Curated annotation (Swiss-Prot):
Organism: Naja kaouthia (Monocled cobra)
Disulfide-bonded cysteines: 2-121, 21-90, 138-143
Known glycosylation sites: 8
Stated name of the protein: Cobra venom factor beta chain
Amino acid sequence: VCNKFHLNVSVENIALMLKICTRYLGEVDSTMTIIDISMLTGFLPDAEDLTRLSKGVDRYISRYEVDNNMAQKVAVIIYLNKVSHSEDECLHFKILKHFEVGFIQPGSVKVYSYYNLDEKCTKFYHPDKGTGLLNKICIGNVCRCAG
């Protein structure tokens, strides 16, 4: 899975800084890339870091509500006109957990563009696990839940 895009998400400590990096797998800068980020449990974007991401016409976020320096979008969308195929157009912003629940659930970051809406490059991110996949003990074809 995840052809047509190089996407790997990491998240590092500091509330903890979430960093996304992406690169197109073609020859031309692909037009109208959509970043589709869904938060963890109880984590909200910083309203002064996401505002820094939306400076200009290069990157466009929709209308979001602001409260207690937290953006009120659990799923957040980043529209940007081009994605580079030589370098890595990275971006980063902080996710502020206010209310704490047991058993944090993995977030997700999706990438797709206009001419490929049949693109399914998703990569989950967990603040404790590396790959972001929730735990399962899996022997070949058949699989089970670890817990």
